[PDB]
Design a protein around this ligand. Structure first.
Ligand SMILES: [Mn+2]
Length: 476
RNA sequence: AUGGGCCC
RNA sequence: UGGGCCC
């Protein structure tokens, strides 16, 4: 995005310099090159002379202004993708009711009861429970006012900033590159679900390479489905973006909402409007109130869906801008926000696409750092998606999501107080695909202290989930 | 100490 | 109601 104005308001909001992620017994054993993100401005382990909040908003390099030819090209790509998208999902995207928006629908889960309320509720100190009732499906008078304001399109708001308490690489922790969370108001999140919840739910259930979205997927079971698809193609690319969410230019965002969420496809008139308010935002960090143009605020409703849609359109846009006579069936892809895997039988040159992505404001680079110039001939077994490799299981002969051991060590090395036991059960479901020897080694430090599930138990669970009949066939 | 997904 | 992982 582009920072247009900065000013210090008289009021001030509390941040989060507590870092709840404490080390575990594993940390001393594995000695990982990872640690909690630097939340304090005077954090001792930061590099010399690094002002934290200075680095925080360094992602906002600018709002890439597109030309009329480029905007016209982008509009056609948005329309063509939208055509494909709604032909699979259908045209049933009617306005969702207040009950359905809160309680969810078949595909879309309910809203989080105990979570950050946003502005101007966090200042006065009113949580979601005060405004919206739990397990009820109704809204208070403060929210009701916002709904009617959003109908007339008079509603305005400001995004609340929060430092993301998470584990990051020590190089980025020392650099002071802590990621930020853009918390929108609860009424915005609610109304967004009313406008496009029917659409979002439908995408989750129909996730796959056809619509080009992995939002709604379960890696354990769906890795087989995706693996077999991408293995069929000759060339596969593990593309990585640089600040994908921040670098969404206004022209790209505005045109995408105008083509995808039209009244022709069943959406409400305000479905376009509510999404367009994400373009120009006002972010509140402590005392500084920063007005920003362009970029997606990470924390609005359907952020992963909007990013996924934009990601799909960018690939279509970039190819058509370089090559001639390119269509949707020319290539295949699936994405989850910024994360993407592209494939095609044609020998496409992604190195030549670099500047065509730069017109959108995006900077694509290869995930595989070796050479670092977008080579050809790669397969699904080389690439990564959702921090998971695609490896063939030696027993069942299906693809399984295998995370890197160094990543798994970093996860196990840190935890909140009291959550260690429950975390060890959850992470074991991820670690099972690494293999019996690697599974044992990852949970070796925790032996004789916490409950560690067996390899046999979690493997047999996965075999039932990935198919179910595969387990039954082995008996006969 | 968000948005959504998935597993508990 | 709470925990984890991914984006
Ligand atoms: Mn990737």
């Amino acid at each position: 995005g582009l920072i247009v104005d900065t000013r210090d308001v008289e009021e001030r909001v509390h941040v989060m310099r507590k870092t709840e992620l404490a080390p575990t017994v594993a940390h001393g054993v594995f000695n990982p090159e990872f640690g909690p993100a630097a939340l304090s401005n005077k954090d001792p382990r930061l590099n010399e002379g690094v002002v934290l909040d200075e680095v925080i908003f360094s992602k906002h390099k600018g709002d890439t202004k597109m030309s009329a030819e480029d905007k016209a090209l982008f509009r056609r790509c948005a329309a063509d993708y939208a055509s494909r998208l709604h032909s699979v999902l259908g045209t049933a995207n009617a306005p969702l009711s207040i009950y359905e928006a809160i309680k969810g629908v078949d595909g879309l889960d309910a809203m989080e009861p105990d979570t950050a309320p946003g502005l101007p509720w966090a200042l006065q100190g009113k949580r979601r429970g005060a405004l919206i009732d739990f397990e009820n499906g109704t809204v208070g008078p403060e929210v009701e006012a916002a709904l009617k304001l959003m109908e007339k399109r008079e509603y305005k708001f400001a995004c609340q900033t929060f430092l993301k308490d998470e584990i990051r690489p020590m190089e980025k922790v020392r650099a002071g590159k802590t990621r930020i969370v853009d918390v929108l108001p609860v009424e915005h999140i609610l109304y967004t679900r009313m406008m496009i919840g029917r659409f979002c739910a439908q995408m989750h259930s129909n996730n796959g390479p056809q619509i080009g979205s992995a939002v709604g997927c379960n890696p354990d079971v769906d890795w087989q489905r995706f693996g077999t698809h991408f293995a069929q193609y000759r060339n596969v690319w593990d593309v990585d973006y640089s600040a994908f969410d921040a670098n969404h230019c206004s022209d790209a965002m505005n045109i995408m909402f105008e083509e995808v969420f039209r009244t022709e496809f069943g959406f409400h008139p305000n479905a376009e409007w509510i999404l367009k308010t994400l373009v120009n935002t006002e972010h509140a960090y402590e005392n500084k109130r920063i007005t920003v143009e362009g970029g997606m605020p990470s924390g609005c409703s359907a952020t992963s869906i909007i990013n996924t849609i934009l990601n799909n359109i960018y690939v279509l846009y970039a190819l058509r801008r370089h090559y001639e006579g390119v269509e949707l069936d020319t290539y295949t892809m699936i994405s989850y926000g910024d994360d993407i895997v592209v494939a095609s039988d044609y020998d496409l040159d992604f190195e030549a696409l670099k500047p065509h992505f730069k017109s959108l404001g995006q900077t694509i680079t290869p995930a595989d750092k070796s050479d670092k110039g977008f080579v050809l001939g790669h397969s699904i077994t080389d690439v990564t998606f959702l921090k998971r490799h695609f490896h063939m299981d030696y027993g069942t002969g299906f693809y399984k999501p295998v995370m890197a051991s160094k990543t798994l060590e970093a996860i196990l090395s840190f935890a909140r107080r009291g959550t260690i036991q429950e975390k060890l059960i959850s992470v074991a479901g991820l670690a099972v695909h690494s293999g019996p020897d690697e599974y044992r080694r990852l949970f070796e430090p925790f032996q004789g202290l916490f409950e560690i599930p067996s390899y046999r138990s979690l493997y047999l669970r996965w075999v039932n989930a990935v198919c179910g009949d595969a387990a039954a066939l082995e008996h006969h």
